[model samples]
Target: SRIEREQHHLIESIEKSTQYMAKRRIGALISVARDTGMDDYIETGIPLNAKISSQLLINIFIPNTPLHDGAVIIKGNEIASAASYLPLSDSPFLSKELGTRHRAALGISEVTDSITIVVSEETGGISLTKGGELFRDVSEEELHKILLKELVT
Candidate 1:
């Protein structure tokens, strides 16, 4: 649970700069994994394996882009893949307001122990998913705690 030590830089960027993306309404779907190999369903696209950085994320999630349309998966402070896809949640109970990314974010957690950070372009809202539950409009402080809990603690 503590590989976060080596991943401190990545964690710092996520905790500190994620709000900036939200402030700008630059939406992003970043899935951070904690053990529990997700290869069974998490579609690995554009094998990146590059160290995580705000610059890289910015470039990947720019508007009107294919990569941005999908998602990014992180493994040990590195980009495991970009432009990735995941099994989507088909629950009709979910609000239609939530787009595919949110479903994918929530869907992955139902099967694997993973955390997905979602910044909405429509409202610049910060959302996160864990244990098959999605929490929306997360405050900056709460986001930090969640990041710390999953990626650090």
Candidate 2:
């Protein structure tokens, strides 16, 4: 089914991107803690620990919508030419509120039928943020349920 293929691909993309983000997040947390002299957490937990990452991601997505719909919103933008087509290296990624992480995900989703999930390192929550709007909130357990709904109806 078309839905099945999209879900499979989205989940795969989420894991792949999230893995890269996890590594980058670790580095960011370490760097931030070191610069700010908050190194005590090193012994207790890594910076941007799992909880923080989850919450941050959920906060970006609008509560209640499914991830599938969010991905569609992103892919649908291609019709507007609002998607980024230039080389990623040329894109500015260090904005104040939004950084390379946010822009890169948005950029890729804009170009292809890709859905990027930026999981939070805290609280283990899931969010769907597309078109500069928060689309949904799905906890780890509810995620599959959400996906099923979007896929079936």
Candidate 3:
């Protein structure tokens, strides 16, 4: 019961924050899930251990900020880390157009059950990766449905 509630709240905040970031052309990477062990696949980041919030997420991704470059790892309702580096995907089949962030997101998904959310800085696109499959350029409604189905189901 607690886990479900936490997941719901986190996803809702993320959805709202993500939409705002999309409008401002800010980029971000967020990883959340209960099953996957991401520590092994990612470089350690600044320890946050703080509750998730839309403004905090937005602030962390602001360009030129120290935490803007890496993924923010969220475990349960708290942010586990920030500016974390994920392993880059080297798949030959990956699209040449995918940038560092997308590659890193897919890289995390390939090895873990974690769901990776990516917002493109250049295109202002929202994408999600899970089970090694990436759904790019997702609409707001689509993103909401996918998160609910994957994290709430």
Candidate 4:
């Protein structure tokens, strides 16, 4: 029950950002790589999800790119501090053994005023976070209730 609802919100949230900022983020990621060698990460198996999280970082943080061929921008305090960028987020993927996808999802939750759910590719046990904290031994019913409230408000 909780799994179904979180998946719905995950899809909904990604669609919101994707339509509004994803393309601009993709452009910013490309630019960051071109400028800062952040692109060297492509060699990793974790590339896809890591880069996707970078899109959020770029979208929310770096509001001005002198070289954005044609990109929209978002300016907001929700952006994490500079320490919140790369390698820091990369640490979870590298040292915590959570791998890229899980780390990326956590990175987003850690910084944003948003909720995150990680569907374990291995056990199908779900992990969830909100407001930068993990839910404890939470039941599916409870999870769904929280999600329903968040969506309504």
Best by TM-score: 3
lDDT of each: 0.78, 0.32, 0.86, 0.36
- Which parts of model 2 have CA positions greater than 4 angstroms off? 1-98, 120-138, 149-153
Task: Assess the local accuracy of residue 82 in candidate 3 as a C-alpha lDDT between 0 and 100.
Answer: 89
Runs in model 3 lying further than 4 Å from the true structure: 41-43
Candidate 3, residue 143: lDDT: 93
Worst 10 residues of 3 by lDDT: 34-43
What is the Å distance of residue 31 in model 4 from its true position? 24
2 or 4, greater by lDDT: 4
lDDT of 4 by residue, 113-144 (tens): 44544333333334455544555323456656
- What is candidate 2's CA lDDT for residue 9? 55
Per-residue error (Å), model 3, residue 20? 1.0
What TM-score should be assigned to candidate 2? 0.30
Better structure of 1 and 3 per TM-score: 3
Model 1's TM-score against the true structure = 0.88
- Model 1 Cα RMSD, Å? 2.3
lDDT of 1 by residue, 1-153 (tens): 446556676667675556767878887888888888865434567777887787778788888986776888887657888888877977676568877778888888787898888888888888898878889889888887777767765
Tens digit of per-residue lDDT, candidate 3, span 1-153: 987887788888899889999998898999885586776533488888888888888889888998887889988768888899888887877788878999998988898899999998889999998878899999989998999988885
